Amino acid sequence: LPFDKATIM
Amino acid sequence: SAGENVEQHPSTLSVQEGDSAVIKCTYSDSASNYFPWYKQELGKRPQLIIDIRSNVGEKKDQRIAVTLNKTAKHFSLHITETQPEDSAVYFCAADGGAGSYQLTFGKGTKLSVIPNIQNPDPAVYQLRDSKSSDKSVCLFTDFDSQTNVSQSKDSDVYITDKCVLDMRSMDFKSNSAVAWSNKSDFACANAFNNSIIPEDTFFPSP
Amino acid sequence: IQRTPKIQVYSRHPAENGKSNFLNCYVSGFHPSDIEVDLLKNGERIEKVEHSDLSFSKDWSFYLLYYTEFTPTEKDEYACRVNHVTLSQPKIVKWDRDM
Amino acid sequence: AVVSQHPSRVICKSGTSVKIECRSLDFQATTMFWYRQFPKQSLMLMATSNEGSKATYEQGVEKDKFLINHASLTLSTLTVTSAHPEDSSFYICSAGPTSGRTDTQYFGPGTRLTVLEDLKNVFPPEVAVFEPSEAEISHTQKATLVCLATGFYPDHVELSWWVNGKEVHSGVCTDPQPLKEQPALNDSRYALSSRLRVSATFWQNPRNHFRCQVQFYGLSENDEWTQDRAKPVTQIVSAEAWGRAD
Amino acid sequence: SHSMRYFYTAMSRPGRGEPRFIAVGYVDDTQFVRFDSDAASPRTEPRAPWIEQEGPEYWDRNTQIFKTNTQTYRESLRNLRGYYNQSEAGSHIIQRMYGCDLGPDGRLLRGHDQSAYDGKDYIALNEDLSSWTAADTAAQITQRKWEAARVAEQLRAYLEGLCVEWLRRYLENGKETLQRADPPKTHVTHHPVSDHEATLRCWALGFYPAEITLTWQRDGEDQTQDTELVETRPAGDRTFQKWAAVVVPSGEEQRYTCHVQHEGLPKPLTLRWEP
């Protein structure tokens, strides 16, 4: 299962 | 979010200054891994005070701590040596559930930290205006926290609720309520009478 | 940076003339990702060629496996034709059943 | 990582459209959340603003009433169309730098929206400072000043204590809420009071200044008259005292 | 030790609409998922038989995550272009690799999270799972944003929790294949290159996992400087191949020995040219 939180670089 | 429901216990809490306050939250979803706590003072924004994640059992920041039991699905906020300034609505949240992403909030806990009055000196003083002949108000002050400031049945008399001030510099806290009326006949005893004021009330003549 | 593709042309099983097998063209160590790969039978484009999904190695360079079902013979020539930005002309690597 | 809102307070006549901004001041946000709070202080999620997609409304939200627009990576707007008195509430947004499954959220200051059927009922406060009693000074060696703000409508007022031109917080306490001057009507003007307690020695010095400030939030420039009274514009109404020696 | 990894590739393409996002997932050396944003309705797809057991909600959950990533990488690509003062006419690539290594128990042994820009290291999460290593100052702008957003804390909770739990579930569901080491089928071939020098080729075939050691020895001395080693390659059936070659003068064929190390082998193999 992938990581479900993403933060713009 | 569809599968997440956060429940806050208790909904209201009164604690004595210096005592500890514990607010417990329960959650339902296994996809919950982030658990924040917000403090909201009246008319102000919820402020993040502490949070915890699913890989941590306990986190402590001075007088505030949070604990998590991920197997039982509950987390708690612990405030130690409560101060009257901790009085606010506290909200917990979880980030689990399926569907649209969101934090799922608890409905809140109104925390009331009752101040400790070590040297009560109850009194009803009459105060005069600075600016002009505006002219006067009644101040019931220095009563302990056991005193209940009841509203008046006379529509022309107004009584505010009790209110605590802290003189930080000299380790002193005190309660006060104000009364006034537009009627000429009004005396400071009409508002702060025997049913409200303690028997040791200093009540000088104006 | 840019990395030119490394090419290996080989069969899934030990080559046996007349016996059905799979011809593989493993393109690795290339950067950026855009790449054109053709499997050739006697210098002509094999039409039914499949490829693995794009992935990369620890050094960030990309790798892909292009493959087709084939039947090796003693005299038919098999090759892999690759084009990438780092190549002025398509690179052709002939299949050698001993490598 | 602050989030802000504009306006912070709105008083408008029924039928007007009110646009509220939510801005991430120092981060980019793909998502913003809009909430509504009533006296029963729970945070009611209304809608989720999505960058490059239509808003996601919660169950029970009149969609056509509340228009949500994700304008950019920093701004989301909420529009309350044809506002009516029942739409009066505290509208608050949140945003965070992390996208996907919601993480740390930062709330805006909130917007207090007050919708009135008739703007004739708007009034600023009258403010008075009451000097500490001699009886209190003699008995306690402390001196309590009392500020009183009366006759204001609506409940849009903020009170502070200024000693020698600087704002104070120590020895201060303001009523958590105003009281209805007539607790038996829809429209009832309000009254609020506050207290500042200093040592008797501090009140005695005539070099010391005491000011009670009441920031009132009323009408704006565009709102126009048909009456004879003074314009109930957003203003500061103050009352002051000076040190008293005896 | 067992591992789970996700590999992301985000590429801008100035004259082909908006950026393309591709994700692939692996359990050890077996690929099990893919997603490619280059479709009208992109969806996550199975790539191993043991993942087809997961129901529709699992596929929707994955799709929602990879759609968030498509949007997020579009903005990251724009931001990185600004840090490097690059033109909007050029095509750029962000790559990311993250995942967990499992211990003999079912415990997180090591967590990972690395990003690259145009094929070079950009930012990586350190071993402590609480701090970053930035390659340059552009990466330190990203690091500042990620420290303010507490990305290292979010990753640590993922890596210590869901990453190892889902890896353990996958290893159980696909145990017949994922928990079975296929030892290499070995042999040594002989190829004359000239009249008095012939190449000896040591073959390792049909092995799983890909990790293998192939070495040539002249009487027992590591011929590492003279050995030609080909990169491990996929057979296309989820198994791997590799060979090690040596140019040997004609006569001393019995002097050289090949050494094979693989987890599928009870003891390491020693081979020579027969006959």
- Total H helices, total E strands in chain E: 5, 16
Q: Which of D28, D101, D103 sits opposite A8 (nearest CB)?
A: D28
CA torsion through residues D52, D53, D56, D57, sign: positive
Closest to E204 in 3D by CA, of E269, E255, E256: E269
Residues facing residue E21 across a β-bridge:
E10
- The residues facing D3 across adjacent strands are D24
Angle formed at CA E55 by CA E49 and CA E57, multiple of 5 degrees: 135
Distance CA D45, CA D65 (A): 15
Per CATH, the homologous superfamily of domain C1-99 is Immunoglobulins (2.60.40.10)
Contact E143, E126 (CB under 8 A): no
HSE (side-chain half, CA atoms, 13 Å) at E131 = 3
Count of all residues that appear for chain E in the document: 275
**Distance separating alpha carbons of residues E48 and E176, to the nearest angstrom:** 13
Between CA B177 and CA B141 the distance in angstroms is 7
Q: Does B34 touch chain E (CB under 8 A)?
A: yes
Q: Token pair of B111, please?
A: 């925390």
What single-letter DSSP state applies at residue E98? Answer: E
Tokens 């699905």 correspond to what residue? B73
Residue B84, phi then psi, degrees to nearest 5: -55, -25
Q: Are B35 and B70 in contact (CB under 8 A)?
A: no
CA–CA distance, B169 with D133 (Å, rounded to integer): 22
Q: Are D97 and D111 in contact (CB under 8 A)?
A: no
Which residue has tokens 């034709």?
C81
E154 and D103 within 8 Å at the Cβ level: the answer is yes
B28 touches chain D (CB under 8 A): no
Tokens (6 digits) for B88: 């606010």
| Cβ <8 Å between A7 and E94 | no
Question: Residue D233 gets which letter from DSSP?
Answer: B
Rounded Cα–Cα distance for residues E255 and E272 (Å): 9
Would an 8 Å CB–CB cutoff place D107 in contact with chain B? yes
Residue among C91, C29, C92 nearest C56 (CA): C29
Q: Rounded to an integer, what distance in angstroms lies between the CA atom of residue B186 and that of residue E137?
A: 73
Taking the alpha carbons of D170, D171, D176, D180 in that order, is the dihedral positive or negative? Answer: negative
Q: What is the DSSP letter of E208?
A: B
Resolution of the entry in angstroms:
2.3
Q: Does E233 sit within 8 Å of C33, measured CB to CB?
A: no
Alpha carbon separation from E210 to C11, C12, D157, E240 (Å, rounded): 17, 15, 72, 6
Torsion sign (Cα): C58, C59, C60, C62: negative
E166 touches B: beta carbon within 8 Å? no
In the structure encoding, which two tokens stand for residue B164, read together? 């605590």
Note whether E touches C: 3 CB pairs or more under 8 A: yes
Distance CA D16, CA C58 (A): 60
Q: Cβ contact (<8 Å) for D101 and A5?
A: yes
Separation of alpha carbons B30 and D121, rounded Å: 53
Q: Which domains does chain E have, with CATH numbers?
A: 1-180 (3.30.500.10), 181-271 (2.60.40.10)
Nearest chain B alpha carbon to D182: B155
Method: X-ray
- Per-residue tokens: E122: 């950009």
Q: Which residues contact E149 (CB under 8 A, 6 or more apart)?
A: A7, D27, D96, D97, D98, D103, D104
What D43-46 contacts at long range (C-beta under 8 Å, 24+ apart), as own/partner pairs, is: D43/B46, D43/B91, D43/B105, D43/B108, D43/D92, D45/B102, D45/B105, D46/D78
Q: Are strands D9-13 and D111-116 parallel, antiparallel or unpaired?
A: parallel
Closest CA to E7 of C97, D155, B31, C56: C56
3-state secondary structure of B165: strand
Backbone angles phi, psi at E210, to 5 degrees: -65, -25
Which pair of tokens denotes residue B53? 């994640």
Are B124 and B140 a contacting pair, CB within 8 Å?
Answer: yes
Instruction: Judge contact between C10 and E233, C-beta under 8 A.
Output: yes
DSSP, res E226: T
3-class SS of residue B168:
helix
- Give me the count of residues in chain D: 246
Q: How many residues are recorded in chain C?
A: 99
The torsion defined by the Cα of C19, C20, C23 and C24, in degrees rounded to 10, comes to -110
Which residues of chain E does D27 touch, with a Cβ-Cβ cutoff of 8 Å? 145, 148-149
Alpha carbon separation from B103 to B91, B95, D50 (Å, rounded): 11, 5, 15
Read out DSSP for B47-80?
A: EEEEEEETT-SEEEETTEEEEEETTTTEEEEEE-
Query: Which letter, b or e, does each residue of C77-98 get, where b requires 16 or more Cβ atoms within 10 Å of its Cβ?
Result: ebbbbbbbeeeeeebebebeee
Place of tokens 């029970």: D60
From E24, E95, E243, residue closest to C53, measured CB to CB: E24
Question: How far apart (Å, rounded) are the C-alpha atoms in residues B14 and B10?
Answer: 10
| Residue the block writes with tokens 């007007």 | D16
Place of tokens 């996929």: E234
d(CA D161, CA B127): 18
Domain ranges in chain C are 1-99
Burial of D39 (0-12, 13-18, 19+ CB in 10 A): exposed
List alpha helices for C1-99, DSSP H.
Answer: none
Structure token pair of residue A6: 């993403």
Cis bond before residue E192 (omega within 30° of 0): no
State the sign of the Cα–Cα–Cα–Cα dihedral B172, B131, D178, D220: negative
Cα B21 to chain centroid, rounded: 12
The answer to whether residues D204 and D243 touch, using CB atoms and an 8 Å cutoff, is yes
Q: Give per-residue burial for B103-123: e unless 16+ CB within 10 Å, then b.
A: bbbbbbbbbebbbebeebbbb
